[PDB]
Amino acid sequence: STIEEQAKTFLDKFNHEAEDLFYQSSLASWNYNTNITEENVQNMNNAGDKWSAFLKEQSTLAQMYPLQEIQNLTVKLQLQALQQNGSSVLSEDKSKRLNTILNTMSTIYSTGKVCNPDNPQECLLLEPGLNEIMANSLDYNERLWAWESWRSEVGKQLRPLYEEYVVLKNEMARANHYEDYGDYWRGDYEVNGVDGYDYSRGQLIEDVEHTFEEIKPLYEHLHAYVRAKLMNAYPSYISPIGCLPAHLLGDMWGRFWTNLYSLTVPFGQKPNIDVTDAMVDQAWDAQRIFKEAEKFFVSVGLPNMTQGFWENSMLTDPGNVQKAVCHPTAWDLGKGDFRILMCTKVTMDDFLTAHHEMGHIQYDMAYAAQPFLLRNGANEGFHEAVGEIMSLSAATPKHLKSIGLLSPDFQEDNETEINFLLKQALTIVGTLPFTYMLEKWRWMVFKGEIPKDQWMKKWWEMKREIVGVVEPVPHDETYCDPASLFHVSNDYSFIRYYTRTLYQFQFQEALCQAAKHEGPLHKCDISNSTEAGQKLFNMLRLGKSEPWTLALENVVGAKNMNVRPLLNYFEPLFTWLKDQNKNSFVGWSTDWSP
Amino acid sequence: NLCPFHEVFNATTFASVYAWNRKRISNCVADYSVIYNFAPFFAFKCYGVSPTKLNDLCFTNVYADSFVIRGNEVSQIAPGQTGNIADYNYKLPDDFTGCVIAWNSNKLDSKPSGNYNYLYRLLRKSKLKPFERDISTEIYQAGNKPCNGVAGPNCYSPLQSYGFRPTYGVGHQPYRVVVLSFELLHAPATVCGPKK
Ligand SMILES: *[C@@H]1O[C@H](CO)[C@@H](O)[C@H](O)[C@H]1NC(C)=O
Ligand SMILES: *[C@@H]1O[C@H](CO)[C@@H](O)[C@H](O)[C@H]1NC(C)=O
Ligand SMILES: *[C@@H]1O[C@H](CO)[C@@H](O)[C@H](O)[C@H]1NC(C)=O
Ligand SMILES: *[C@@H]1O[C@H](CO)[C@@H](O)[C@H](O)[C@H]1NC(C)=O
């Protein structure tokens, strides 16, 4: 009985009560999310405590089979996933302190309410109020007030906890045989053992920087166009030669530029594409939406879904009788149970999100044959990229005309193409510099080579050079501006949104080439292409067994992120921008002084 | 004389796959039409015997093994398969003149709290042999150190449970399987089909 054989029999008695306990916990979470009561909260607490205790016990009984004495690769990956100490390396007091820090930060961010104007009677909260008044605001003074009000109260509470949180996380990562918490996070895009298909945790930084260097000129042109469009609407607020203000990007943190479309749309006289009217006058419901999504998937070639999916998934809100969060997510409860939880309205955006979550479900069903610890995407961007492939494909005018929402009388022109491409670039390209900036700042902070007394100083000097966003007012060191973000405050990796953007366009170009499609990449339809479906499924059914480097090559032919699929996707928009904004300055000045 | 072809198919409970129930049937009229009463039959493979010519032959003995497995483990109930059921729980010979019948039982079996009464063996020292039954629950020692009885690390009990919740998929739902294995020993046949 070799150590590898012992490892194979442990990870076969794990993969069996893990799956059972994970199904129990997932069912508890699902029934809570569909029915918010106190019994459901207690059931989640019990199931999660049992699952966590089982995971901890299984990890301590796995620390036995040494990795250097194992020659297999699947067993090696399973034991690597199971042997992660996590937060157990810290002392008891330090671990409880870190847990309290995380809980307090999450509660402060979720319950954060700014009441600066007038008396504290009038205060708004995140989803309807603050998001509504930041999304659609035409007042520079009001936008400045809201932005500086959140950045002041929330950041001043976050920073004293944030510094000690960073110290604790760095200590835990160092005890985990890593270099820092940034290295611990980057250790997900790591392949060690496979010849020809391998990766390093610094190679991720190098590749991300190189890809950003490649994408930069398109971002500069888009930024110049956005600045030119914003100056006309906002006189004397944006200098013709300077950078772009922080509070003017629709979102509170300027993550997405999608909401900056009313002041940016070039062809206002030309109406945008929208199928809501025909979709609502054709008597379409959530059942028909998901049936048409599954029709698209089976036309592509992927298998149809289980009968229990329809009878168990919650697709419509059951009135106000019971309370249920309707955030769209795809549930993989375990033993053959796939469910979709979303409040489906009859809208184009809800149709697209249904396609996105249905692609997530298809990915989940693809690798259901893999062992429990290998039932995930190859890296943490593969799932979102796979879903976004179908989300992009289902929104094409050709697919809409074939489906029936778009009348044949509508024609396709370069004007509508440019409109759609500009909206897509505002959604997608506009967030890549911000994501790279945020993750670079977090990596540098966790590295510790930079000092601590100029965190905000370096944050704002990196915002200007990388994103082109200038601080509207000076900020001292008492602020903790990056901690105002959901992922930064709640300890979430953010490079996944940069990686998924490249991966999705890689996949789209590969599948459009495999579908024998001729023409622009943005007018592509993977539907009715069994070859494209099979090519996608080849990578889709691998799960986490094969390295992401090989999984990428199995569908694309490359071995790392490539900007070129993005650039050929956005080439018509790039040419239009270059031809249009030639009379205006491109880029942001480095000599700006407020 | 009508022997329990109905009773083996229509039973309140079915034995686990690791310890299956085998019923020896003899001194009978065939009356195979009783089997076809159940409509939802998920599989009616008939290795070695035509599925319409059963009511013409005579066999010395007929064995009706019955057990409960998953939906995705029904494919392993066949001559020459491999997995965890076909080599540690229920192996059937390469020739296997007989029929395999399986239908879904997500209503009779299964329970929202978890039907843990149906167990299988996930670990055994050696592969099973055609029509062998291993009931012993000793502790499997997986390496280099005696378990010395009930034990925890590198030890590991052998029988694992299924759980069978009714919200499971189709390949994870309980599937009652009845396997008919006709024996053709060179003895006067006691089971025959009716004929005028
Ligand atoms: C949802 O919760 C309510 C709250 O009492 C209760 O009727 C039951 O637990 C659940 N009902 C349904 C229909 O899910
Ligand atoms: C690792 O073990 C599995 C057991 O199912 C086997 O399929 C696989 O081929 C092994 N790896 C290698 C590289 O042989
Ligand atoms: C799935 O789609 C196929 C189309 O090939 C259809 O025949 C089948 O009935 C569908 N099943 C369900 C459960 O929708
Ligand atoms: C796919 O093919 C079917 C049948 O040929 C057709 O009805 C449908 O409109 C096609 N869809 C697309 C997007 O080409």
Numbering used by the authors:
A (entry chain A): 19 to 612
B (entry chain B): 334 to 529
Show me the paper's own sentences about this structure.
Since late 2022, XBB* variants, especially XBB.1.5 and other XBB derivatives with a proline on residue 486 (486P) on the receptor-binding domain (RBD) of the virus Spike glycoprotein (S) started to dominate, which demonstrated enhanced binding to human ACE2 while maintaining extremely strong capability of evading humoral immunity. Interestingly, L455 and F456 are two adjacent residues on the receptor-binding motif (RBM) of SARS-CoV-2 RBD, and the variant is just the “flipping” of the two residues, L455-F456 to F455-L456, also known as the “FLip” mutant. These two sites are also located on a critical epitope that targeted by the public IGHV3-53/3-66 Class 1 NAbs. L455F caused strong affinity reduction on XBB.1.5, but significantly improved the hACE2-binding affinity of XBB.1.5+F456L. Both L455 and F456 are on the core of the RBD-hACE2 interface, forming a compact conformation with D30 and K31 on ACE2.
As we expected, all three spike trimers mainly showed two ‘RBD-open’ and one ‘RBD-closed’ conformations with one or two ACE2 bound. To further reveal the impacts of mutations of residues 455 and 456 on the interface, we determined the high-resolution structures of these three variants’ RBD in complex with ACE2 at resolution of 3.3 Å, 3.0 Å, and 3.0 Å, respectively. Although the side chain size of leucine is smaller than phenylalanine, which should slightly weaken the hydrophobic packing, the packing among RBD-L455, RBD-F456, RBD-Y489, and ACE2-F28/D30/K31 is largely kept in L456 mutant, which is in line with the slightly reduced ACE2-binding affinity of F456L. Our structural analyses show that in the Q493 background (XBB.1.5), F456L provides a space for insertion of the side chain of K31 into the RBD, consequently introducing a hydrogen bond between K31 of ACE2 and backbone of S490 of RBD to compensate for the dampened hydrophobic packing, which cannot be achieved in the background of R493 (BA.2) due to the steric clash between ACE2-K31 and RBD-R493, making the co-occurrence of F456L and R493 deleterious. Consistent with DMS results, L455F significantly dampens hACE2-binding affinity of XBB.1.5 RBD, and F456L also slightly weakens the binding to hACE2.
